[PDB]
Amino acid sequence: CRHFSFAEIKAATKNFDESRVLGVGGFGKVYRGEIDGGTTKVAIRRGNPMSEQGVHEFQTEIEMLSKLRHRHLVSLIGYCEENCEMILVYDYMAHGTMREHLYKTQNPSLPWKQRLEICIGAARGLHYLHTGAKHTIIHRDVKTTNILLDEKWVAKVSDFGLSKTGSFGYLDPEYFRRQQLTEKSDVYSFGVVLFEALCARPALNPTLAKEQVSLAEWAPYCYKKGMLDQIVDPYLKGKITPECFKKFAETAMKCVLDQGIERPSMGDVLWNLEFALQLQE
Ligand SMILES: Nc1ncnc2c1ncn2[C@@H]1O[C@H](COP(=O)(O)OP(=O)(O)O)[C@@H](O)[C@H]1O
Numbered sequence: 001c002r003h004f005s006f007a008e009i010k011a012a013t014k015n016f017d018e019s020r021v022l023g024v025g026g027f028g029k030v031y032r033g034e035i036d037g038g039t040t041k042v043a044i045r046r047g048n049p050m051s052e053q054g055v056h057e058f059q060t061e062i063e064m065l066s067k068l069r070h071r072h073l074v075s076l077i078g079y080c081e082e083n084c085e086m087i088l089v090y091d092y093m094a095h096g097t098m099r100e101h102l103y104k105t106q107n108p109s110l111p112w113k114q115r116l117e118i119c120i121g122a123a124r125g126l127h128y129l130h131t132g133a134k135h136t137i138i139h140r141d142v143k144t145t146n147i148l149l150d151e152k153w154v155a156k157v158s159d160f161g162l163s164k165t166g167s168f169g170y171l172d173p174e175y176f177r178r179q180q181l182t183e184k185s186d187v188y189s190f191g192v193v194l195f196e197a198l199c200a201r202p203a204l205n206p207t208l209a210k211e212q213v214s215l216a217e218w219a220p221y222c223y224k225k226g227m228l229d230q231i232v233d234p235y236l237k238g239k240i241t242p243e244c245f246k247k248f249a250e251t252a253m254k255c256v257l258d259q260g261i262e263r264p265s266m267g268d269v270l271w272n273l274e275f276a277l278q279l280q281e
């Protein structure tokens with residue numbers, strides 16, 4: 001994990017030109033830049049060291065990502081702590097977040113097979129977090145804005161600021177009851193991602209009728225009542241084979257079960273998604 005001088009960062013971002021702002025968030029602004037004389041494009045996050053959670057989140061991200069390597073996780077190339085600043089350098093995910101290709105966007109809708117391959121990629125990333133590091137890593141912030149897409153549409157899990165080792169629509173309701181957090185909490189949030197990919201609507205819409213506010217409650221309700229097909233993304237209607245639809249929906253339903261101990265592991269989710277992709281052929 002390489003250290004960047006603050007002069008290298010500023011050359012990469014052309015002194016943090018708002019020309020290069022890809023997006024802004026709680027941690028800070030993210031800039032599009034290039035390093036190694038322009039051969040490598042990078043995303044550069046500038047935090048504010050006066051925030052302790054900004055600093056905590058910065059430190060968590062470096063201790064986690066410096067030890068992980070996986071095709072479906074955003075790679076941390078390095079950081080810059082000079083001037084006691086907080087700069088993180090990742091490779092650039094050219095197509096942004098999964099959310100911005102699902103709804104409230106004017107990007108075109110994603111074909112069904114591409115949505116499934118994105119979910120499969122994210123599942124492999126989470127599977128690696130749960131089974132491939134020294135100890136289980138609970139991401140704690142799986143959501144459609146923390147799955148990024150590179151220029152060949154490969155899905156990568158990102159934003160490791162809240163993860164631990166050793167967002168409203170997505171929180172495991174068992175955590176406000178059992179007060180213990182498990183990798184099954186990632187499985188719950190991922191089940192919500194799956195329904196978001198199918199339904200192309202936010203996980204939490206506070207303006208709706210009481211039954212529909214929470215996708216994690218609404219979509220299973222609709223399935224049991226035999227009407228999940230009516231709330232699917234209009235672009236996807238008619239495009240999902242019946243056997244793929246049943247397998248995808250049943251997998252998603254199992255993920256958002258009430259008790260974590262009844263939920264499948266990510267390995268089981270991943271295999272069932274790959275099986276759903278085979279049934280779509
Ligand atoms: N590696 C990356 N490549 C390209 N864009 C990125 C990368 N990492 C983060 N971003 C952008 O930065 C934004 C800020 O992320 P975050 O602070 O979590 O806000 P949000 O949760 O609303 O996405 C993301 O929405 C995304 O568009």
Ligand SMILES: [Mg+2]
Nearest residue numbers: 025145146159
């Ligand atoms: Mg994010």
